[model samples]
Target: GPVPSRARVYTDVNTHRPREYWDYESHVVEWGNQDDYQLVRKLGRGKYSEVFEAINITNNEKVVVKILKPVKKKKIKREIKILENLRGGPNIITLADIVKDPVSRTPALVFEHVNNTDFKQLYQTLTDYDIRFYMYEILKALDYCHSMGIMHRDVKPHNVMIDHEHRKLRLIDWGLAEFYHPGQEYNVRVASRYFKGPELLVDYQMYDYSLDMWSLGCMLASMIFRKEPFFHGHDNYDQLVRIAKVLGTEDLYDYIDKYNIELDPRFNDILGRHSRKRWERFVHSENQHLVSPEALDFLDKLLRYDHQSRLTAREAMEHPYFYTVVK
Candidate 1:
């Protein structure tokens, strides 16, 4: 039998909560009036839903209308459950109401409007200190979710809205998010490819909140390295290869052995043994200001192949790199 591994912290967080608190499917949702919110303009569209900037006729306030595509009822319930649970937590997107069309029964999740700067443009303009501040803000969101027994499967720059003018950051898109239960075999297909953790790539279903830490690490690396996705992989299999090329394949095997994870046969032909690359190799005159000794150490800790070795969001905030960001 393979060795069982649990989260370093908050392992039994759900155990402390009432059954009804974590039970979303059984909970009845009170759908609000659809007439109150009118869609103004399209914001963005993802695979799962169409997002729009909308206004509330009741309060004349801007709100985000994220219309769910045809999906399972359980998913709608889960997203509603999570947003309500994390209503006002640090850096969390505030869900104002859930509404559905009377005819089509198409559901929409309305969130407080964030005057956001698209991360692609915003990250390019961010100073080193700006990066530190915003990254700390994101850490607060992650720590808060983990403490509340949830794991944000989708953690990426796209999902994090930054209103640079107001120094505000909100973690949005809870569609793939799930409540963390210890010893649970979660779907490895949760996170997007680039930000997916080694645990997911290797098919280790017994993952925990540390999965989000790896995704956050990918975001930081992309920002600091000036690569939109630091791990440039072509497909699902290549995702692991890209990571192995940087982190090396030998240690990857060690991590797999630790969990007794059996690699899929498809990896045999495509995989090559690679030597680990040092984090400093990514540093250059352009990104040197954002790449310090403490920063390298922090990134190093979070990008570990062993999910357990990755820094918890709480511990990550205490790193010397974030010393300047402390309030």
Candidate 2:
């Protein structure tokens, strides 16, 4: 099999320019109403927007302002509509206001301020039960989105926020999100490869809400152990090997035969051996200290080789392991 070449895109994170000309704020218009509120601190940065915590002087309310990049008027309008229509659940970030700034022309979305740190940063302080509680909240959120026909393509610790007041989990960042129905298919795939599901790695012809389940499993594993991502690799080949190592097999031909899933030529070399025993060895050897029996059971179901065999968010919530956890 031939090794696949990786593509890289470089962007200047520190490029400075006038507020109006900044590429990050081009799509979302800014609102002057927030100027009086001093910029307390930056929350984080992403591909299209930067988030900040600020004080709203008018009512002395603390709020989160997400300044988005410039985009087509139609897309900007559509995003606002989508955000507005979003209903609430325990795991979702609640939307408060969406405004446009007259000066920079970027859009600023005002949301109820959540003061807690993201789960990734909060892992150090939380107990084992807390981690389970957090995962439950995330699953609840995903289940809600699934019922609404929405797929949060990006499901990582960074996107899951902790609300100090309620001690709950809130999933944010709707940039690469999509709304899908049963039996529908997407032509383009957009998700972090490390958390990507097997179906996505093999084919783009058809997919469903199950992809989020794959990421959920990865996130749960990361939080329980607070370690590296499940599929960390130096390259695509390494990535497949890493996945196969965890999943117990590299039988691309078997998968292709079973599901009609196409295999990239790069994987042809590792095609035929059953690596299940090898996978169990690594799981027991490497993750022994970090994972509980219940957690391992959940991971086994989530990291299953077959996408169809993976547990769904709803089913996962019902797993006996979680049932044993004290709330």
Candidate 3:
């Protein structure tokens, strides 16, 4: 891919950080005693780990215990290092401790518990203002992480825990996150199917923090448009097609040509030219209240096929969609 000119917003953000700051090989995890916490119930599971709601026996407080599945030592260390580095950053999940079974040597991460309502139910109840408010909260997390040279890689409703009562939001799941190094090629395998950015779908590996903005755009689209998944692709190849159907296959081609990307051969059959669909096409009586000029404009900027064209988290925070509520 050709080096992106205008779209590379944070090329210099990580330039001065020490190599070890982004290097996982140097990570030395200090293990804690697993006996200190007792599992209360299972929370969720992913390809990488199993999550449990647990109690800190010493303090009798609730916490989340994420137990690692059998995998590469390097991957485990990478997640631990990134979590530790972002420990005090805004809206980041607090890592209380790291523990492992003494005999099985299975590792687990202990974190502060959040009372999160399932997004399916929560999004349905939110007023328009609530949408802007929570999206702004997510931006705060993204800005903080990007400034610290991290790209979350995965940003979706599932990874965001919101306690609507307190109006609090926390960005969880750092398993796919990586420290952004200038011009470094990253694995395109990160992120959930619907939330994946164009760069990943087209096999563009030198993406940056802008990738999160794309995912954020997808998330915001789903919330405001009242579609469970704004872009629902059946598979990886189909993911790009789904995006093209709305964003236009022509623009995708332009993006691919600009980067000199060699798209997967399978795309030839499914890739048909599409005119960019108007966001208003999604508006109906039920969701019309959520649609506004500012909201539409904000989503436009974030969902651009060109990653660089998407707003940085800091830039997004200043958009007029947030201006009315930001103060």
Candidate 4:
């Protein structure tokens, strides 16, 4: 049987290639010399690496080269495995080629160059219309990931890049992703503190794909209202307080009952002191006119206190809010 045109082949990021290598199997080749490739301006930097624009010498094609230093070997390997698993889908970023540093013995992953900035930057520059378009693309990507049984725990703006020329959205960074399997408890607190789901906040050992939903809510809120995270606090207690202030006793009690979640006595200060009405009032005052109807709808689904009530990425894509322009 012949291979399908859409079939994706996985390659190891750390595989050493000939200085000028050609792969007859996949028709994907690497040019031996780095000097021939032109390095453009720096795109962005992360804790472990930096991304830059580069022109491939062989074909003069543009690509984003992500360089990983010695310190991030383990993370880069994990990212490579995650990328290989994330084979199909338009919403996720595509890995093109891998290159090795001649001197430092470092490794670099080359991806198709996306023309636009990430959601964080996009939110700063674009209006509601632009954000809607971007969000729709994100939903498409997330929907596809969910179908593949992959959970991208970090759904922040920084991981979502835009292609302005094509009006396309691409999800980047798989460093925090996990393969979602039923009947198995996933223990990994991989996302940022503010975006972490309730399950992770209360019990990190028991978690699931709902973590993505939580991050989605945070990203949506950030893009629309720029609402400061409920708990930008330093510790667990502080974080719980931030959330308790928002949800209050009635909401928290209802959630605790539904999910059978245990609440610490320390949270009593927030749960007992603040009323549901006051919580709503705080949200209203803090967000003001920033959140749009569509955004609010998304928030409602993604920000559920009960992880079980959270919508999967596919369900979110099916919501009417995304259908307006996703067709």
Looking at model 1, residue 4 earns an lDDT score of: 78
What's the ranking of the predictions by TM-score, best on top?
A: 1, 3, 2, 4
Residues 1-327, candidate 4, lDDT per residue (tens digit)? 111111011112212433212121233324345554567878778766778899988788998887776754455655665566565686789977667756546667778877875445556666666666777778777766655556788877668777776887789887667655444456645677777766676653445666777788777766566555544656665665566556555666676665566776776564455453322343464454555566666767777776667777667767766655646
Better of 1 and 2 by lDDT: 1
lDDT of 2 by residue, 1-327 (tens): 212211011112113323322223244533355464555788787666778887788788888877777754444554554454454665678777766644446877777776677554676566667667777788888877765556678787777778745876678776666555334466435677677766666654455567788888877766565665757867555666667765656454455457655577777686345556432343444445556778778877877655557787788889876775565
Candidates 3 and 4, the one with greater lDDT: 3
- Which lDDT value does model 4 have at 129? 63
Candidate 3 displacement at residue 269 in angstroms:
1.8
After superposition, which runs of candidate 2 have C-alpha atoms over 4 Å from their true positions?
Answer: 1-38, 71-78, 118-120, 164-166, 250-252, 269-274, 277-290
Q: Which candidate wins on lDDT?
A: 1
Candidate 3, 68-161: lDDT as tens digits? 9887668989999999999988899999999995644678989989999999999898889999999999999999999888899999999999
| Best prediction by TM-score | 1
Candidate 4: stretches off by over 4 Å? 1-38, 71-75, 118-121, 183-187, 228-231, 234-236, 253-273, 277-294
- Which stretches in model 1 have alpha-carbon errors above 4 Å? none
Q: Better model by lDDT, 1 or 3?
A: 1
